[model samples]
Target chain A: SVYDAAAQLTADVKKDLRDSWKVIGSDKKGNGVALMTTLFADNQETIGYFKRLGNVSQGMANDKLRGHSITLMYALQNFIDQLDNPDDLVCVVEKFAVNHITRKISAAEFGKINGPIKKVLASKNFGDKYANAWAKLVAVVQAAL
Target chain B: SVYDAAAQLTADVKKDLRDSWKVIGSDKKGNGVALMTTLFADNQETIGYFKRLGNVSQGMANDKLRGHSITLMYALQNFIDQLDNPDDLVCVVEKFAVNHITRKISAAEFGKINGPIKKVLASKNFGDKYANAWAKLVAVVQAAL
Candidate 1:
């Protein structure tokens, strides 16, 4: 039951995030770069459409602001590229800041994700720093998207 | 013995980087806002700076090529903020396309070391990324001092 639930939830989260706007901003070359970095997307052509918009930046490229968005985006790409399962994916975020741009959430928040995160798995022991890092990344992506 | 040796080497490498004209051009506070972000020095500061800078880009900040020097400085900061050791710092740079930015060793690099990194031990892993992030911050302060 645990295995199946974890598997199912993992699939659901992956689908939810993939369909979300976080991955929707890349231009053709950006998408190409994203693809070259990892193989996750099923709809390369659609992603390519957004990539054609050229390299996107959420802030100015100079004068103390530059590349913040690009940095965040690349960090996110690196985060997403390393996951094999949704639980592990979130776990990676919780344990390490991974793609977080803003420091938000805490490990406790992630440990509260239900299922193995609570009673059965003892995810509570993971510590607050880890949780907060994950929350930060999620919050930033959520806000940006 | 190896630990001390490694530390010496890391300091040397960072010094060389500071002296290199190639890196200095990208290591200052010009259009890239590297100086502002460096001054902000924390996530809160970074976010506030980004919000203001974001306005300058018409809501987009791509400061990479135009502010290459600042970008390099930030990249160095990115390296320093996350490190506990020097070797791990090197690993973070390997993940990027501009690995060359950090490859050299110079005397100006020696001039770049200002002080020890604070608030870094609180992170999840004292791995490469952490080290690299910390290095960047250190580099900037060193340059200014």
Candidate 2:
């Protein structure tokens, strides 16, 4: 019941955000909020997969929630710090991408979540170069995934 | 004047530590001091280097001091956390070594600093594995350098 409720709440929030896109904008204005949204989206996918697996328990869904929440939070800080202070965001992202791939985190999982973020990030002032670089990183991650 | 004095102090301290090792016994209690006499014996290299560099110019040295003090403090915390907590130590050290080699920090520099540390770390039971691991890691940094 809680799993369904939480997922439903998340889905409803996405619908609300979609309804209020002008307020949210197409840019990276609120990186934290955007990251939270991105992670929620990732959790939605995990839930969807588990639902297909049958006997999808609340504990299972919550486990996915806990794991992805921590991971995305870690990744979000690294991503934002790279963007804000770095002279070479692409280079940093490339390094992170390579490290993640080498550690076997997988490209497909990265693409599933990081893809949309890159799309949104590309839509912002970080430019086409950053967008392309991020896509390449995603490609690498996807291959590993 | 203060800069020169500081440099001289660091050099003197390092020399004292080197000369006093027979009495020091490679343990914290053996030194009767809290910070310096533990596993981080090679921090003298950093202090000595900074002190010498800092003596060259007051303003420049002050700025260098600010940047490096922050960087080295973070580096120290990272090392201690990695060492004390085994979960991420190897990966963190690997990444740091990779970054250092990639940025051309130099093995000659690493070895000059790393050599004494290896010797000190190997003298302990818990630290022996780390010392060996670090030796292999330094070898990697050296090759890369």
Candidate 3:
């Protein structure tokens, strides 16, 4: 498989992802906020990636930060929507990477997201099957980055 | 134009949504949980659609019901995404139309979420700015269905 190739997600795995994500996306904004909240809480420097969102303590009151969080889910949704289309999926991830260029973000910065992503799902009560499915997606996206 | 086209949602309205929703999606699960809980609380019988959740007091511990709330948020999101694409928007509308018809759900029953939405969003540092805007979007979609 090529480096840019999207993960070879199985049908069941995709279902697991959609099902889990349905919940995740269910609260895409807050869930995303919760995610960023966790990452920054654990590794404080992660907040340096954006001028908005400020500190984890600022909470959901910040509309701009929340917007970024929501789009992150939309971005993830865009990934899931294009899952069956591998080339399209890769292009989607590549765009995410490209979008980061002017903003000057990082793989390690993005890489810091995985633990928080896991913690969020865990808080929502999703199991390993769900986590593993998401991990695969994250791994591929990270590899591409 | 699609007969059920939910167009005429102005540019500002769409931007407001993209702007405000990031935070709404921020805590998609919990915010949605609060919303559903509010709906069922204000009007008790509304819980009938979801047999699993049983009662609003049960809270987010019930993952299945939380999933429903999350999906509702995503459904609105899908609508927001397709606002400019009327034909596609109608399908998204009708998808709900078809699902509700089977359940014999009521229009007021549908609008029940409206009142609860106000208060729940209010919890998110809600303001008149986004509220007036999204409420209009809700009305447009409500009329189409």
Candidate 4:
């Protein structure tokens, strides 16, 4: 029940997201780097897709890493900002998902981002409920993708 | 003159800002920390004001710095988003200035943020005209403060 789940995104959950984003989005570079780094770490094969990353390494400071990470973070922020407007949320995610599709990014690859994002949130001590809410939101986006 | 300047914020200026913030707000943590750290670095005495950042450092990894920096960056994002609405811009900055006043933050200290903000924008290679638009916008906010 994707619609039901989307409906379950209570005002409280939205508030939680708004509050948590302050931390998640805080160190844009650090967190963005951490996110992509974890993504590459967990799924080494994915690194080949980012030609800009050349040969991936442990240290995550590079133009490609910074640029892509920032783009992803901003996209997530836009998604979070539109939580109150369910239609707009769908619109934005759908648009993003389509853009990825054109770039040959699969739903599975899109889903892979979930793990690193969750890991980053947990590291920030964002707690279980917040993470769960984010998970649900991710699921919704995955379906749209 | 303040109102005149505020009115001078043409659709073009707002459009430029809307385009520019994509980059500025992209690395919330990185740019946020960079802007704040630069502020502290250039104005060492200001470091004492942030009880959380007791001693200034370049690393930019601490929780206090991350949290405050994220908050500040979001505030600026909100300000930029409201650029099209001059009255709302004034209202938002005035409200923020009043909040700072209650927190014992002087208009002078509040004004000082402009320097670091501009420096960060310039360093981003945001160009002179864009930087000047930002400067005028900051001036409007300073006047509100």
Candidate 5:
């Protein structure tokens, strides 16, 4: 039923999410930095989990932050693109989860990212359809993590 | 001297072109159609040239036009990405010229596309750097064509 819920995300929601992402994808570096900055600000404790973020200050203008943000945005884009195919989606999320585990990121910390992500999406005026779609998608990914 | 001219394109030019492409890259379908529409409108003769565009009206909302535009934009992007590498750039342009030759696209006709392309790039506010780079790059391709 849970998997169905994730898969059942309305086509309208999917379209809205993809349409909204065009802006994010257009300036991945800028948007990624913004997203990461929001994440770090919302949950400062999680910053210690990322070794690369050690030198990254709250200002989020450093190279390390930029690199990490780009990488994260790319990964998120990949996950969104693969949402239609459950097997591929699960595979990508599983790999992401495994990679984060290696980086000392616990599932709880991973869950903490959802708040900042939603915040960023809301700030972009992505609407409730996007929020609803993301909620189901993130829940599935959190379970996988 | 030919290679020297090609190599004169500084990293700034390549970076500018690539950075400016973020907009075109964002909405390939919309921009591509807009491009193809401009191309056809500016040179209506080319419309009859493309058999696929026969049924396509001036409205520019058909699948064939969309596909062709996407393909054209992709080729342009590929050429821009390889601007730093003279060998690769020449190789791509040469291949493009060869392909167009089979379609009966003369060097002059091929050159005509440059105006519409420049207009598109300029409308995006790509500035003189992109124009200068494209001028040099198109000259090389035109020679090969």
Candidate 6:
């Protein structure tokens, strides 16, 4: 029940962790793509939509690929901006889920459960506690889809 | 040949003006989508590529369309980052031209010209000098198509 425990994260804790992710933008690095490159390389279902993006292995070094990757993070970042608001949350999440399908990917579905992806957070920046809280949030929307 | 005079823009000026565009990012307000609403409404050509972005007139008020609009600015922002390099001044414009065509529109051609778009910048923020310099840049890539 880590998901259950994650459900218990305080709004104070959730907001603080959210800001930490933004802090990752220090110097405008925008490295969320660091995680996305993995998604494209491993997630066969949605990565299919990006076939024209060229070689999956060449990411970060690749311009369009990096832009798309960074964009997914930017897309998620908008939703993250709305984390504390419940009524407002439905409006944004449903739109994002449907339009992500427009791009031909199930973004919320990608968040369900992935150990390799979970490994993306087992470190200083996010650590275990922050990862658990985020997991619960992703779980909410993934279930919606 | 205002475009010819615009060609006279010193790389130093180009770089400075490019930085001014970035300064528009202050406070995290990504309003590049501001001009995008115009492109969607008045420009019939490439707007077809975004057929599903929803009612064009509701732009700034619409989420998906705004993201797509801001995204176009992000795309241009990438090219703007390359302005001082002759490498562009080929590589980027060429890549972007084909890139849009591959995506089903000629974004490069769309840059051929736009008066309302120009009007979007007519006031204190850009003034005439910056506008002419930017026009020449838009003209070059647009013609490359």
Tens digit per residue, CA lDDT, model 5, A3-57? 5646665677677668877866677656778877877778878777766445656
Best by lDDT: 4
Off by over 4 Å in 1: A1-9, A21-63, A86-145, B1-145
lDDT of 5 at B4: 57
Q: After TM-score superposition, what is the CA distance of residue B131 in candidate 5 from its true location, in Å?
A: 27
How high is the CA lDDT of each candidate model?
A: 0.34, 0.39, 0.68, 0.70, 0.66, 0.54
Q: Can you give the TM-score per candidate against the true fold?
A: 0.25, 0.27, 0.50, 0.50, 0.49, 0.63
Q: Write the per-residue lDDT of candidate 5 for residues B1-145, one digit (tens) a residue.
A: 4355567777776677678777766665567777777887788888877774446574444545544564555566656655766755554566566667777877678777776767778888876767666676666666766
Candidate 1 chain B has its poorest 10 consecutive residues by lDDT at B115-124
Q: Model 4 off-target regions past 4 Å?
A: A1-5, B1-145
Worst 10 residues of 1 chain A by lDDT: A58-67
Candidate No. with top TM-score: 6
Across the candidates, what are chain A's individual TM-scores?
Answer: 0.33, 0.35, 0.86, 0.86, 0.84, 0.70
Q: In model 5, how large is the Cα lDDT of residue A133?
A: 65
TM-score of chain B of each: 0.27, 0.37, 0.83, 0.84, 0.82, 0.69
Every model's DockQ, to 2 decimals?
Answer: 0.03, 0.03, 0.02, 0.02, 0.02, 0.13
Q: How do the residues B1-145 of candidate 2 rate in per-residue lDDT, one tens digit apiece?
A: 2122222223344333334333333332212222222213445444444342244233222433333322332333333323322223333344455556654566677666455554544444325444444444344335434
Q: List the residue pairs that clash in candidate 4.
A: A26-B29, A27-B29, A28-B29
Candidate 2, superposed: residue stretches over 4 Å from native: A1-145, B1-61, B84-87, B114-145
lDDT of 2 at A41: 59
lDDT for each residue of candidate 6 in B26-97, tens digit (9 for 90 to 100):
322235555666565566565666666777667657666655554455455555644554433344455556
Alpha carbon deviation, residue B98, candidate 2 (Å)? 2.8
lDDT of 6 by residue, A30-132 (tens): 3555666656556666566667677757755665565555445545555565455543344445545675556654645556334433555553356666666
| Residue range B18-134, candidate 1, lDDT tens digits | 333233333233422433333334333223323423433321143322233233444554453323444333333333322223434232533232211222222223345444544
I-RMSD for candidate 6: 5.6
